[PDB]
Design a protein around this ligand. Structure first.
Ligand SMILES: CC(C)(COP(=O)(O)OP(=O)(O)OC[C@H]1O[C@@H](n2cnc3c(N)ncnc32)[C@H](O)[C@@H]1OP(=O)(O)O)[C@@H](O)C(=O)NCCC(=O)NCCS
Ligand SMILES: CC(C)(COP(=O)(O)OP(=O)(O)OC[C@H]1O[C@@H](n2cnc3c(N)ncnc32)[C@H](O)[C@@H]1OP(=O)(O)O)[C@@H](O)C(=O)NCCC(=O)NCCS
Ligand SMILES: [Cl-]
Ligand SMILES: [Cl-]
Lengths: 298, 298
């Protein structure tokens, strides 16, 4: 496992997608270190660039520590490592604690991540799958790969129960990561449906796909539209606390697409100001759901 | 001076502002290392957070190497160091070469940066000034500072001719970094003027100011509007080569501002497809020009 001391920089915090962007770069580094392949320059046998695409992404914090807690110069301890998911994919976990936290030097513990998460630590799960394009300049119909050098044989095992697959399968079906039958919540009747042309000035990565962190900005763009429709103020929006968020990346899209962003919310009937917001990103033209996200806020 | 081996990551390339975002984080690190102060957590004697704000920013490359050249997994060598600009500000330079480039291990050379820049290296100049807010939650009327611990006494001297001040003074007056009387260019008659409400989902940093790299996205948003008005295609826009770009940050803005982005272009009468594009960002409500940028493209 990889432990690092991190002081929070402008390029990894704030109300945008910079933190999630840093998290994914750490993911690519941690896999490179544990899987004997340079993930950044990865190509298949043929010479085709192969990308370790984000597929399932979770960030879980709490009141004591969440992404909105991080400010310039915060001292953090980050512990990272991969878990075996076979030859075509890999799960990467990252734990973040405030430096000099009680027990901050803890090693990665699957039981802690999946069943006993502590208020005051941030837990990150990135389930990634190697992909290539099926055709130059197309971002649709990407094809599963495994770069020749990729080695999952050194990695620790994950037990069947902690499988990200069961998690994301259920989310693609239900369009939420939190079952509608969860007790202690009531749906609100206002929803929103926003058109979003791909933003080529902002949304595009260095290999001409939609950048994984842009999905989090698109999701927040929908949350904002629904926030506003509820009457609420730009100001209180920036005060929103996100204690948990899950994202499934079902597809990418060509750079001329017009996407649709739909959002709904359930309000706690147990705690005031606790809310579960569901966002679905569709590419209506290809009949594809390309993303689903649930956000647990306060 | 600080030399690093860098492999290009998703979080520092592409047609957005991720490269400039990485450049500024390197700036804050390099000053922290050469000036005996933790720039990330900097505060004045009073306890007030003090920010090493970007004020003048230049990225100069060329055909052989420019920001659009960088792709995932590119091996680079980066050399960084600061130069004395007194007690309230500091100039940071970064040179970027392809790793195993001829002479890539070169030390920083002011003569090379300012008068003999080589095709095949990227030269970055960041002139930064320490500032604090004048009032909580206000992004206007920021006030000059120097964190108690800041030390410029170890740093190398810059000769009067290489002064970023003369450069940026002239740009605030002329609204371009390339004098209108430059021979070998003809102005085009199409210009554009776009309204841009501050984007709170994207544009905001972890201390609630407009993030310095967002200015580059706002500038590109104006370049795009003018690009399109010239008839041109989203596709050719992504093929634009930027061989040089300068930015002056005259102010910040409150998070409810509606900004105006104006753009014009001069076409080479010496080379086809060589163009100089000028963008001015105004906050009409406060009567303030907050940014000016010139881009030399191909
Ligand atoms: C991973 C992926 C190729 C799986 O393909 P699929 O059609 O669901 O399943 P098959 O393996 O049957 O083909 C597809 O879900 C996908 O392209 N996901 C998007 C990943 C992505 O773009 N992430 C953001 C950029 S890294
Ligand atoms: C630096 C600054 C305070 C200088 O103030 P000024 O009014 O030009 O000059 P005075 O020193 O006379 O006051 C002002 O130009 C400024 O606030 N610049 C914006 C810097 C910025 O926001 N950068 C992006 C975010 S880091
Ligand atoms: Cl990406
Ligand atoms: Cl900033």
């Amino acid at each position: 496992e990889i432990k690092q001391a991190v002081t929070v920089r402008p390029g990894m915090c704030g109300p945008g997608s910079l933190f999630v962007g840093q998290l994914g770069d750490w993911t690519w580094e941690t896999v490179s270190a544990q899987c004997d392949t340079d993930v950044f320059a990865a190509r298949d046998a043929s010479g085709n660039p192969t990308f370790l695409a984000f597929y399932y992404f979770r960030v879980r914090g709490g009141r004591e520590l969440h992404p909105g807690s991080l400010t310039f110069g915060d001292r953090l301890t980050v512990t990272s490592g991969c878990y075996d998911q076979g030859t075509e994919s890999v799960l990467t976990l990252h734990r973040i604690d405030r430096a000099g936290s009680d027990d901050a030097q803890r090693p990665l513990d699957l039981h802690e991540f999946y069943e006993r998460p502590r208020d005051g630590s941030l837990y990150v799960e990135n389930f990634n799958r190697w992909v290539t394009r099926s055709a130059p300049g197309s971002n649709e119909d990407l094809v599963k790969s495994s770069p020749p050098g990729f080695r999952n044989d050194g990695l620790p095992q994950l037990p069947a129960a902690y499988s990200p697959r069961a998690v994301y399968r259920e989310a693609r079906t239900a369009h939420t990561f939190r079952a509608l039958d969860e007790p202690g919540f009531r749906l609100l009747p206002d929803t929103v449906e926003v058109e979003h042309p791909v933003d080529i000035v902002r949304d595009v990565n260095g290999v001409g796909l939609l950048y994984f962190a842009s999905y989090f900005s698109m999701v927040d763009k929908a949350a904002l539209a629904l926030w506003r429709r509820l009457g609420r103020s730009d100001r209180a929006f920036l005060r929103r606390v996100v204690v948990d968020q899950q994202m499934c990346y079902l597809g990418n899209a060509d750079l001329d697409s017009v996407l649709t962003l739909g959002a709904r919310v359930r309000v706690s009937t147990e705690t005031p100001g606790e809310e579960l917001v569901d966002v679905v990103i569709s590419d209506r033209d290809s009949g594809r759901v390309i993303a689903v996200s649930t956000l647990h806020t306060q």
